[model samples]
Target: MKDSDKEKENGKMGCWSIEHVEQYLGTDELPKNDLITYLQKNADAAFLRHWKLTGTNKSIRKNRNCSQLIAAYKDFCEHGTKSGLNQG
Candidate 1:
């Protein structure tokens, strides 16, 4: 199957997989440092746009704080397009 098909099957949409995340971070897990900045710097614009479109809570979007963004990122990483945070 094609890579796009695989991603769709996994419900990943524009979300990155664990392997992609690891490669982006250059580590095996989420960093303890400024995760928001790290993601902003490393993640592509399309992924960021997808995050804004589907992964964030309305309240979180209003505030756009570091903690909320971090939470959204974590949710996106773990659950991708199936993330409960997408309901908002």
Candidate 2:
């Protein structure tokens, strides 16, 4: 969204940016395959709680991508487990 703004306000950064991410997101352990779904189904509520990082609204006000699952994410949030993405 305000990525350019963030960088402009902050500074340039590469893939391994200094402020890439403060910390990893999601559960530290596996979610037994039902947690994500549970959250998605409760989007409006969850969004109200966490402000929709998964985009519980599923609608990007900026139209960055004309994509919105609008479907319950009970199975997979990003097509697989949501942990250890950069794990070697």
Candidate 3:
């Protein structure tokens, strides 16, 4: 099945993820990232920096690119067997 269908089947929720970060940063001709560049130039990396700076971890839930980031963050925050990521 398609990935979207898979997500529906799994009852996945939203979260920020490495893929999200990478996709935003993964183009050639992409300029370097810098705090000043983000503030001054409004580049794509600046868009990325905006996400990093304007929000806390919970804010990532709004983006929700992958289930693992949600699971990992849940594990990180709650610290129990219930953790979805099951991380140690």
Candidate 4:
């Protein structure tokens, strides 16, 4: 099966736009820090000791599609964006 088919089968298909995201987030100005940034920063230390980025920088970069994944996840969290298509 193709990657697209696999992703769909995995129930990971998503579509969204930045404008809708900004609106739902209720802030035109996006905060600089987000989930992954928090992970990279404070997901270490005593409190969040178990959470850490456990890989070489090169390795992280090699497989670093975090931003895309995060955006897709966020879009879903916002119940996705409307395409305004006629579903008839």
| lDDT winner | 1
Whole-model lDDT for model 3 versus the true structure?
0.34
Query: Model 2 TM-score?
Result: 0.19
Q: Write the per-residue lDDT of candidate 2 for residues 5-79, one digit (tens) a residue.
A: 522443321122112211221224322122334443433454424423354332422321211112223223333
How do the residues 1-88 of candidate 4 rate in per-residue lDDT, one tens digit apiece?
Answer: 5654422344322223455434433233433223334334422333222222344434443454445334543543454322221111
Write down the TM-score of every candidate: 0.29, 0.19, 0.18, 0.24
Which candidate order results from sorting by lDDT in descending order?
1, 4, 3, 2
Instruction: Give the local distance difference test score of model 4.
Output: 0.36
Name the weakest run of 10 consecutive residues (lDDT summed) in model 2: 13-22
Error of 4 at 1 (Å): 62
State residue 16's C-alpha deviation in candidate 1, in Å: 16
Cα RMSD (Å) per model?
10.3, 14.7, 13.6, 13.8
Candidate 1 lDDT, 36-82, residue by residue in tens = 44444445556556545334344323545444455556665555343
RMSD of 1: 10.3
Better of 1 and 3 by TM-score: 1
What does candidate 4 score on TM? 0.24
